[PDB]
């Protein structure tokens, strides 16, 4: 079972900084991250231009052996274009959010989107389902009807919703994308987790996977609860920007910055976060 | 890890039939059910008069050794009165939904409700959280703050939400109440499940539990999917009435009927259901 | 266009004081309330026993010439009984919430509930739609499908949702149940409003209606915003209980009190609310 | 009180077509539309590149006297840059959706976004509130708190939510953005409506506005109800793409296409929509 990092996109000076990125990718993959999921929500995908996602694809694929590239764009030609680019850079799969933002697109329009994506590449296409962000759900039944989905990341608090894809798509690789379900996802044997904490605490996640494999549910759960406390703190000051600061706190290197409207934490917010997670990081030392 | 049955309330004619009820409890308790949860949502709790919940308490505490009685009422005095009655009948705990229907009660109100329940009895008071029905959530932080909650049934698709109660009340017994999470609940070692399907397929839930305990996570999951397929068909025509028909289908006896506004299935609905589950009743 | 009051249910001691209730009905019908809507949500309907609703039905039809009685119950038989009793005391119509609480209910079961209600009486049956409380919406299309709705009270922030019933049911009386849309509802010419604030500021509602008819939209809107400030303060400490206190504050007499789990405001909350509405009170 | 059109963006073969655009703009503005709201939701704004939004600003300011350009972008530098460009092109105001997509950004991040916009230009900045699409609400109190909002478009079925902006921001021009509230917006005297149907039936909106002003509430309402039946059919089929077909059907010229993932309607869908609306009273 895999630990997939939806890796952060590391800006410095308003532009992407590969190498902050690559040092980061190399760090986390050396600490239990199996797969790198680039241009995910944690990596600000919807906020990146096509060309930024191309740079990220190049940086991820040269820094890691297993890469999935998230390709959604509200211009579908760019999603197709990027899919092909990622495939040519050796990505093992591409993923896409359903068309987001626009309320009540039709089923036919969602279906054409994913079907054009499947036609464009030979590597597997994953559905990246994220109803809270996307404003729509593509559930297991709908994903099966698309007829080409070979993988799912379901960022969903409903573990049943995620398990349902293994039911309808017995051959698909199915992942839960929620940090609060990491323990549970290994326990029910999903194919893996895509968890944002894989950026700052991948060794905690591997700790959990190890515990679950050993049958040590008490340790798994307890490490989960620690992770939850950390997540909770970060949610409090704005989670997308806090991921970067947690990386620095936990991993000890410069992580770059997001870009607005996901503005970087200011120094007050960073000081606060650092204190907030110290209660629970002596409880750590992994 | 326990299988708790939110046992159906078994009307016949239009009135409670306590002997269908007891036959039913005795059967499922011999087929894997560890605790009877009387007057829950599946038992139509909120549609029942105080006297009816009383009669149902007598039947449960007669038919079964472990009974938790669900006492919520939109007259808090009837909740307290039933709690005391439940204890006097030998119930091992009582449980309550939070005050429901009325939007935006204050926290002081909700808290005074639970705290008045705790002070009325010496057996444990369980929170029964069911945001989708109740229209408000009392999460683990809120439950810890109530100060007297000894157990939780959380009917919630969000397993992390259920699991939080173990985080904040590690001494409480915490159960998840969604049928779609039975496998997962056992997998993550909650204290057990309260699942509507304990009425009609208790031995399937004991199977899932057994398989989880072996390590046949793959068997567990596969049993769970069988179970999801059945719940889905029943959801299609009205789950609350359909539970009664599923009991007949799988357990083989008369299950009585719900009471309107939860009207009993009509012949067409039953035939459809019978036919819809026949697909998966064979895969059993 | 009518001002309908969903009158509070006045408890003192733990029990209904129907003299309080009648003095309250008398006072507010003398100040611009046209219809009395008994036992709705503001009246703690779902929290009331059949006997409490019969008592309110008696006192209301005694103190007021136009009474709609809200009858919903999670025992459909009690709803039918109350409807029939309401007819017999001279209610001009009955209303019901759809079956609430239970999430797992079929259209057949909702349709049957209203149709049996329509069969039970000859006076009109209003749908009382209130999705946020009820957990279910019966929209205009669904309401037309029922084939017997003669009126609608739609407690809904979506004014379009409410207007939809006039489109789908042109002969029905359609009322909006939201305090924040009183001004809007008069402006679009719904048949009227059923507004909780009719308990405590019926003359503000009449002032809005006058202003709208005088084409003085700016005064209409400004009275509405004054109302909103008062409602928002009340919402902060627990709206259901605060309504009673607002009656005392603005009407000058003892309104009695709700009943737990809708516990009465405590003295600190009453004091807070009096001071919160004082700014807006002096500006009428 | 104004009729503001959140005007469709007219593509041909997935490329922007300024001539279709300009013809559509000139036509609807001669039939009642007072203001052109460019690159809003009906205009596929979040789907458009910066380049395309600049071309659209150019075409709209060249084809219409009053134009508000919607500038939201998930790269905030682009929103700022487009606000400056729109101002330089003579927009009477810029609007912005709050930052969208990303759940749970901080209030500080949202406030910074809007204030950076306000600082970037001298023309009014409008809040374009659309909780269903955006995933967050910037309500009247929050809007006042921003401290620089001078207009609001509120796409919201809750008319009271929209009227609250008039209470907290008495100088703000406030519009409701929902087609089903055109009649009610005029009746409660909001500053106007930004209704997607102004693309296809501007003269029906003008009619509702005239009926309200003449005290003819029963006509307003039944015109509103005619409109609701049309919108309902379009919704049934994919509203965003249906809008283009409705322009053609109702205004009698070509409207171009949307661009995928908002794919154009197919033949069967267009035929269904035509029948649905011919029947629609």
Q: Which helix (H) or strand (E) holds D204?
A: helix D202-213
For residue C22, give the 3-state DSSP assignment: helix
Neighbours of D97 (CB within 10 A): 28
Element (H, E) at C145: helix C140-146
Does the distance separating the beta carbons of C161 and D181 come in below 8 Å?
no
C102, B100 Cβ separation under 8 angstroms: no
CATH number for the domain that contains residue A77: 3.20.20.70
**Distance of alpha carbon A120 from alpha carbon A73, whole angstroms:** 15
Selected for mutation to probe chain A from D101, D108, D117 (highest A CB count within 10 Å) is: D101
| C252-256 contacts, C-beta under 8 A, 24 or more apart | C253/C23, C253/C24, C253/C27, C254/C12, C254/C20, C255/C8, C255/C10, C255/C20, C255/C24, C255/C199, C256/C8, C256/C10, C256/C11, C256/C12, C256/C17, C256/C20, C256/C21
Conformation bin of residue A162: beta by default, left when phi > 0, alpha when psi is -120 to 50: alpha
Q: Alpha-carbon distance B169 to B176, whole Å?
A: 15
**Partner-chain contact C160 D228, CB within 8 Å:** yes
Residue with tokens 């007057």: B39
Cβ neighbours of C137 (radius 10 Å)? 15
Instruction: Describe the crossing of helices A50-63 and A76-88 by its angle, rounded to 10 degrees.
Output: 20
Which of D140, D165, D188, D216 has the highest number of chain C CBs within 10 A, making it the mutation to test binding with C?
D188
- Measured CA to CA, the distance from residue B51 to residue B57 in angstroms comes to 10
DSSP state of A148: -
**Experiment type:** X-ray
The answer to the question of whether C154 is labelled as a binding residue is yes
Angstrom distances, CA of residue D256 to CA of D24, D33, D55, D67, D198: 10, 20, 16, 21, 16
Q: How far is D147 from chain C (nearest CA, A)?
A: 21
By three-state DSSP, how is residue A135 classified?
A: coil
- Torsion of the alpha carbons at C15, C19, C21 and C22, rounded to the nearest 10: 160
* Alpha carbon distance D166, D185 (integer Å): 12
Q: Binding site annotation covers C153?
A: yes
Q: Burial of C160 by CB count in 10 Å (0-12 exposed, 13-18 middle, 19+ buried)?
A: buried
The structure tokens 């609807």 sit at D28
Residue to test with chain D: of C139, C158, C174, most D Cβ within 10 A: C158
Q: CA of B170: which chain A residue's CA is closest?
A: A222
Name the β-bridge partners of B192. B2, B175
DSSP assignments along B78-116, one per residue: HHHHHHHHHHHTT-SEEEEPPS-SSTT--HHHHHHHHHH
Active-site residue identified among B84, B112, B144, B153: B153
* B79 neighbourhood in chain C, CB within 8 Å: 261
Residue (of A232, A184, A226, A235) closest to A204 by Cα position: A226
- Chains C, D: CB contacts within 8 A come to 67
Task: Give contacts of C158 with chain D, Cβ < 8 Å.
Answer: 157-158
* C-beta separation of D159 from C156 below 8 A: no
Residue C154 sits at φ, ψ, to 5 deg, of -120, 105
Of the listed A31, A53, A153, A270, which one is catalytic?
A153
Dihedral angle, C-alpha A98, A102, A103, A104, nearest 10 °:
-60
DSSP element (H, E) containing D250: helix D239-251
Residue contact D166–C217, C-beta within 8 A: no
Q: Is B180 exposed, middle or buried (0-12, 13-18, 19+ CB in 10 A)?
A: buried
Q: Which of D178, D188, D217 sits opposite C183 (nearest CB)?
A: D188
Residues of chain C with Cβ-Cβ distance to D165 below 8 Å are none
CB distance C181 to C159 below 8 Å: yes
Task: Single out the residue of B43, B50, B51 nearest to residue B21, CA to CA.
Answer: B43
Q: Beta A35-38 vs B173-176: how paired, if at all?
A: unpaired
Residue the block writes with tokens 């959604």: A72
Question: Are the beta carbons of A148 and A126 closer than 8 angstroms?
Answer: no
Which candidate, B8, B9, B80, B90, places its Cα nearest to that of B50?
B80
Length of chain D (residues): 281
Q: H/E/C letters for each residue in A30-49?
A: CCCCCEEEECCCCCCHHHCC
Nearest to A188 among B157, B161, B183 (CB): B183
Exposure string over D255-273, b if 16+ CB within 10 A, otherwise e: bbbbbbbbbbbeeebbeeb
- Residues of chain D neighbouring A135 (CB-CB closer than 8 A): 132-133, 135
- How far apart (Å, rounded) are the C-alpha atoms in residues D84 and D117? 9
Q: Let me know: does D244 contact D263? Beta carbons within 8 Å.
A: no
CA B253, B255, B259 angle in degrees (round to 5)? 165
Q: Name the minimum distance, in Å, from the CA of C234 to any CA of chain D.
A: 17
Give DSSP secondary structure letters for D166-188.
HHH-TTSEEEE--GGGHHHHHHT
**Please, what is the Cα angle at C209 between C207 and C215, to 5 degrees?**
100
Query: In the beta sheet, which residues pair with residue B82?
Result: none
**Contact assessment for residue B209 and residue B189, using Cβ atoms and an 8 Å cutoff:** no
Q: Quote the DSSP letter at residue A158.
A: B
B to A contact (≥3 Cβ pairs closer than 8 Å): yes
DSSP B75: S
Pick from D106, D240, D262: CB nearest A238: D106
CB-CB under 8 Å, C77 with B260: yes
Give the gyration radius of chain B's Cα atoms.
Answer: 18
Phi, psi (rounded to 5 degrees) for B259: -130, 140
Q: List subunits contacting chain C, requiring 3 or more Cβ pairs under 8 Å.
A: B, D
Across the interface, whether the CB atoms of A225 and B167 are under 8 A apart is answered: yes
Contact residues on chain A for B181, CB-CB shorter than 8 A: 159-160
Q: Which of D22, D126, D120, D32 is nearest to D80 (CA)?
A: D120
Distance (Å) of CA B184 to CA A163, B37, D13, D101: 9, 21, 49, 30
Do B163 and A221 form a contact (C-beta atoms < 8 A)?
A: yes
Distance CA D41, CA A102 (A): 7
Note the resolution in Å, 1 decimal. Answer: 2.2
Q: Which of C97, C91, C85, C86 is nearest to C42 (CA)?
A: C97
- Catalytic machinery residues of C: 153
What does the angle CA A133 – CA A137 – CA A138 come to, to the nearest 5 degrees? Answer: 130
CB B169 within 8 A of CB A151: no
Q: Residue C182 in contact with residue C157, Cβ under 8 Å?
A: no
Exposure b/e, B43-58, CB count within 10 A at least 16 = b: bbbbbbebebbbbbbe
Instruction: Quickly list H helices, chain B.
Output: 18-30, 50-63, 76-88, 107-120, 131-134, 140-146, 159-168, 182-187, 202-214, 217-237, 239-251, 267-282
Measured between alpha carbons, how far is C207 from C32 in angstroms, rounded to an integer? 9
B109 contacts C261? CB cut-off 8 A? yes
Q: State yes or no: C129 annotated in a binding site.
A: yes
Tokens linked to C30:
């003398």
Q: How far is CA B55 from CA A15, B91, B269, in A?
A: 71, 13, 30
Angstrom distance (rounded) from CA C234 to CA C245:
9
Nearest-angstrom CA–CA distance, D167 and D177: 18
Note down the domain range covering C171: 1-284
Q: D140-149 long-range contacts, Cβ below 8 Å, gap at least 24?
A: D140/D164, D140/D165, D140/D167, D140/D168, D140/D169, D141/D168, D143/D168, D143/D169, D143/D172, D144/D168, D144/D169, D145/D111, D146/D111, D146/D114, D146/D115, D146/D118, D147/D115, D147/D118, D148/D114, D148/D115, D148/D118, D149/D114, D149/D118, D149/D125
Cα B211 to Cα B185, B196, B217, D71, distances in angstroms: 13, 20, 6, 56
Give CA D267 to chain center in angstroms: 27
Q: CA C180 to CA C231: how far, in whole Å?
A: 8
Q: What 3-state DSSP class applies to A171?
A: coil
DSSP letter (8 states) at residue A14? T
List of chain C residues whose C-beta atoms are within 8 Å of the C-beta of residue B98: 261
SS3 D31: coil
- Strands C125-129 and C35-38, how do they pair? unpaired
Q: Is B199 annotated as a binding residue?
A: no
Chain-centroid distance, C-alpha D84:
20
**Would you call C74 and B47 a contact, using CB atoms and an 8 Å cutoff?**
yes
- Provide the phi-psi class of A183: left if phi over 0, else alpha when psi is between -120 and 50, else beta: alpha
Among D41, D106, D244, D270, which would you mutate to test the A interface (most chain A Cβ atoms within 10 Å of its Cβ)?
Answer: D106
Helix axes B107-120, B76-88, angle to 10 degrees: 20
Contact D276, D236 (CB under 8 A): yes
- What tokens were used for C44? 């703690």
Residue A177 phi/psi, 5-degree rounding, is -100, 15
CA atoms within 13 A on the CB side of C207: 17
Q: C50: which 2 tokens?
A: 């059949």
Q: Which residue of D has its CA nearest to C183?
A: D188
Strands C2-6, C35-38: pairing kind: parallel
What is the Cα–Cα distance from D93 to D103, expressed in whole angstroms? Answer: 28
Spatial distance between the Cα atoms of C127 and C169, rounded to a whole number of angstroms = 12
Cβ-Cβ contacts under 8 Å, D114 against chain A: none
Residues from A contacting B (CB-CB < 8 Å) are 157-161, 163-164, 166-167, 178, 180-181, 183-184, 187-189, 215, 217, 221, 224-225, 228
Contact by Cβ (8 Å): B103, B71: no
Residue C29 marked in a binding site = no
Rg (alpha carbons) of chain D, rounded to whole number:
18
Q: For residues D281 and B173, give the distance between their C-alpha atoms in angstroms, rounded to a whole number.
A: 61
Count of CB atoms situated within 10 Å of the CB of C190: 24
Q: Do residues D225 and D183 lie in contact, with contact meaning Cβ atoms separated by under 8 Å?
A: no
Name the token pair of C83. Answer: 């409807």
Cβ atoms of D44 and D240 within 8 Å: the answer is yes
Chains that touch B (3 or more CB pairs under 8 A): A, C
Nearest to A187 among B166, B188, B228 (CB): B188
* Cα torsion angle, A206, A207, A208, A212, sign: positive
Q: Tokens 């976060």 label which residue?
A: A273
Based on the structure, what is the number of domains in chain C?
1
Token pair, residue D57, equals: 């600003």
Best CA proximity match to D248, nearest among D226, D277, D221, D222:
D277
Task: Determine how β-strand A192-194 pairs with β-strand A2-6.
Answer: parallel
Instruction: Collapse the DSSP code of D160 into the 3-class scheme (helix H, G, I; strand E, B; otherwise coil) and give the result.
Output: helix
Report the C-alpha gap between C50 and C53 in whole angstroms.
5
Two tokens, residue B155: 């009917």
Residues of D with CB under 8 A from a CB of A: 14, 41, 44, 46-47, 49, 74-77, 79, 98-106, 108-110, 112-113, 116, 132-133, 135, 235, 237-241, 259-263, 266, 269
Give me the helix-helix angle, C239-251 and C18-29, nearest 10°: 60
Of A100, A105, A269, nearest to D101 by CB-CB distance is A100
Across A11-87, the runs of DSSP E, i.e. the strands, are 11-12, 15-16, 35-38, 67-70
- Residues of D with catalytic function: 153
């Amino acid at each position: 079972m895999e630990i997939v990092a939806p890796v952060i996109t590391t800006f410095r000076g308003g532009r992407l900084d590969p190498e902050l990125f690559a040092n980061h990718v190399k760090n986390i993959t050396s600490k239990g991250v199996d797969v790198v999921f680039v241009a995910g929500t944690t990596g600000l995908g919807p906020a990146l231009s096509l060309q930024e996602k191309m740079e990220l694809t190049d940086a991820a694929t040269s820094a890691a052996r297993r890469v999935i590239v998230q390709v959604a764009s509200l211009n579908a030609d760019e999603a197709i274009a990027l899919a092909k680019y990622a495939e040519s850079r050796g990505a093992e799969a591409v993923a896409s959010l359903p068309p987001y933002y626009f309320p009540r697109l039709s089923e036919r329009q969602i279906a054409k989107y994913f079907r054009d994506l499947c036609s464009a590449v030979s590597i597997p296409v994953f559905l990246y389902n994220y109803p809270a962000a996307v404003g729509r759900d593509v559930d297991a039944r709908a994903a099966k009807e698309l007829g080409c989905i070979r993988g799912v990341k379901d960022t969903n608090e409903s573990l049943a919703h995620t398990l349902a894809y293994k039911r309808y798509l017995p051959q698909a690789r199915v992942y839960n994308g929620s940090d609060s379900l990491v323990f549970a996802s290994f326990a029910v044997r999903l194919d893996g987790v895509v968890a944002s904490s894989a950026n700052y605490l991948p060794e905690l996640l591997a700790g959990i996977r190890d515990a679950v494999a050993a049958g040590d549910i008490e340790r798994a759960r307890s490490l989960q609860f620690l992770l939850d406390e950390i997540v909770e703190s970060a949610r409090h000051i704005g989670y997308a920007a806090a991921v970067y600061e947690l990386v620095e706190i936990f991993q000890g290197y410069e992580a770059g910055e997001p870009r607005g409207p996901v503005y970087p934490l200011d120094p007050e917010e960073k000081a606060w976060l650092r204190a907030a997670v110290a209660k629970a990081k002596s409880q750590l030392r992994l």
